[PDB]
């Protein structure tokens, strides 16, 4: 009873009518019958319905319809590229059936609210994916499918047509093909790969222009801030060597015992840290 859901599926209305079938469909993964839920998300929306059984969601920690993580809204291949691939799960036939069975007993014996072993891992995060995690609901995802009479030029329902009248996606784009099983296991997922390419460009971690340099060239200081903000932020890292301050261009230089600590302060800092409700931007030299 009650599905497991994204906030993005469930709807942008707080009031929702949602129907239930006892054994509605096989799950497209572990292939068992399971309680299925439909509901209307919104005014122009599509009537989504749960695609996979609740168990294999608890297993990989995901929405039932979307298969996007609960916290990050990221396809599974991504958050695995983000932490731990070694979760695994047999893809192969009768194994899948077997492992699902056992893991279904293991889950039965848990407190109920926890994605099994992954959650022991799931706490430690934020490497990148937080910064590539999506922020707001994305409703373009629930729109009705593309009317396929109209996309041949004919559709004779006129304005009534609940489907959507517009140009489809060119089958050329590798982002088209998108199997379900595939998106689930984290194989060759085009979306996930795209997000990976997007991850790399994040100006961030390579640093190291020069050896031993712990000099921090800090842009976007501002004249509200004091140094004491700086120190009481940065004593976490280690033994400071010193701090140079310039308020004429509002840039603050810093120096630490080891370069390692400076890299760190970059990492922890870059395009993340803000104090005095004002962004504190960092660069090398």
């Amino acid at each position: 009873d009650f599905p497991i859901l994204c906030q993005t599926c469930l709807g942008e209305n707080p009031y929702i009518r949602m129907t239930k079938e006892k054994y509605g469909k096989e799950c497209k993964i572990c292939a068992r019958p399971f309680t299925v839920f439909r509901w209307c998300p919104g005014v122009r929306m599509r009537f989504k319905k749960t695609e996979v059984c609740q168990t294999c969601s608890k297993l990989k920690n995901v929405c039932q319809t979307c298969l996007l993580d609960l916290e990050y809204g990221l396809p599974i291949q991504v958050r695995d590229a983000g932490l731990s691939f070694k979760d695994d799960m047999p893809k192969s036939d009768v194994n899948k059936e077997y492992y699902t069975q056992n893991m279904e007993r293991e889950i039965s014996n848990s407190d109920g609210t926890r994605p099994v072993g992954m959650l022991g891992k799931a706490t430690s995060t934020s490497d990148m994916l937080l910064k590539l995690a999506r922020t707001t609901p994305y409703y373009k995802r629930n729109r009705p499918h593309i009317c396929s009479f109209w996309v041949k030029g004919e559709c004779k329902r006129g304005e009534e047509c609940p489907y959507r009248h517009e140009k489809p996606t060119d089958p050329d784009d590798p982002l088209a093909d998108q199997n379900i099983k595939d998106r689930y296991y984290g194989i060759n997922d085009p979306v996930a790969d795209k997000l990976l390419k997007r991850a790399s460009t994040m100006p961030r971690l390579d640093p190291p222009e020069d050896k031993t340099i712990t000099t921090l060239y800090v842009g976007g200081l501002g004249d509200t801030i004091t140094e004491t903000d700086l120190r009481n932020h940065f004593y976490q890292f280690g033994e400071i060597r010193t701090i140079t301050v310039v308020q004429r261009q509002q840039c603050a230089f810093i120096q630490f015992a080891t370069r390692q600590a400076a890299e760190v302060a970059a990492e922890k800092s870059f395009n993340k840290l803000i104090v005095n409700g004002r962004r504190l931007n960092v660069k090398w030299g």
Binding site: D88, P90, K91, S92, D93, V94, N95, K96, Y99
Partner: peptide
């Protein structure tokens, strides 16, 4: 057919006990 040569038939990842198995990996043939 692929329950053998593709994907490890049924998998029991060994249970983990008071020691570190993280590091260990093994060589090819």
């Amino acid at each position: 057919g692929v329950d053998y040569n593709a994907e490890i038939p049924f998998e029991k990842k060994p249970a983990l006990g008071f020691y570190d198995t993280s590091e260990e990996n093994y060589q090819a043939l």
